[PDB]
Amino acid sequence: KGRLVIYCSATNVMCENAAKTFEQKYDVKTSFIRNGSGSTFAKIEAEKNNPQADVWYGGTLDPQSQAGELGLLEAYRSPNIDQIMPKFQDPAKVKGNLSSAVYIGILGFAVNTERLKKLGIEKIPQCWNDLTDPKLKGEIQIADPQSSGTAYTAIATFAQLWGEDKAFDYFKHLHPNISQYTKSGITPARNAARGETTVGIGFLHDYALEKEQGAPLEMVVPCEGTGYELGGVSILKGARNLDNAKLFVDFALSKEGQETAWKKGQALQTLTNTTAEQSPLAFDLTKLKLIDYDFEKYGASDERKRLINKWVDEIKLA
Ligand SMILES: [Cl-]
């Protein structure tokens, strides 16, 4: 049935498994080239007069939205969009499904229950505001917003949850309980897993992997609500293999295509297709208390710079 070239921005393992599973189902000779979302965006833009791939799969949706704005993508609404929550059906800036959401990374925190059992604390924290408990002094970690996008997602989430003023009040009250602002977004997951801290804040699928490997972690989607990142799929405008690109978007949005991502592809993000079985270490998306994250507003470089600078000035250095 021909061939398909994928620019993949997910992991190598997830990409390889998607290519193999797609090729098996549809008998399309499928290959991928893996690169980060930013590098991939630059490549697609550079190659726009003679595109070298058919589809862009995985990684954050925001750069795919920006490519849609620049006329680099081909709009196509898969019938499987019917199986995605209205909220996530057409999430990018230019409407018409130039891009679609294939998974979601949920911001939350996880608690080391063994270490909790040593702090004299009997109940597992279930809310963001539980983390200001003075019993948790020196027992929480989150990444440094200056060096980590994960921590910036936290800032933007709190700002959308409570307004910017109360978000920074919350950071001020959380601050005395933070033992380390880590350089990397994922470090609090490794540290909470090993008992180097009690609570780590970050993307829940990272804590899930530590739990999979045996760490005594309880994952929490905080009670007040929370934010997230989305994974995207998009067809390139001028794709050499447009028919097969549409089949691949169908597949990436399908029950089987999304299930295989965690069943064999080692991905632990929550799936956007509401008919899909979730990993036992992921979540039931329709039941989650999620803000509607405004990526257009908070993804702008000037707003991001401003909010990080405010965090530095008022939290880190005040
Ligand atoms: Cl099922």
Author numbering: 1 to 318
Text from the published report:
Instead, AfuABC is a trio of proteins that bind and transport sugar-phosphates such as glucose-6-phosphate (G6P).
To gain insight into the mechanism of ligand capture by this PBP, a structure of apo (open)-AfuA was solved to 1.6Å. The globular domains of apo-AfuA are held at a 29.7° angle relative to the closed form. The binding pocket of AfuA contains both electropositive and electronegative regions, corresponding to the regions of the pocket that bound the phosphate or sugar moiety of G6P respectively. We propose a two-step mechanism for ligand capture by AfuA. Substrates such as G6P or F6P first dock to the protein via hydrogen bonding to residues in the electronegative region of the binding cleft. Next, the negatively charged phosphate group of the ligand serves as the target of a simultaneous rotation and closure of the two globular domains of AfuA, generating a stable AfuA-ligand complex. This cinching mechanism is driven by the electrostatic attraction of the Arg/Lys-rich regions of the binding pocket (which also includes residues such as Ser37 and Thr150).
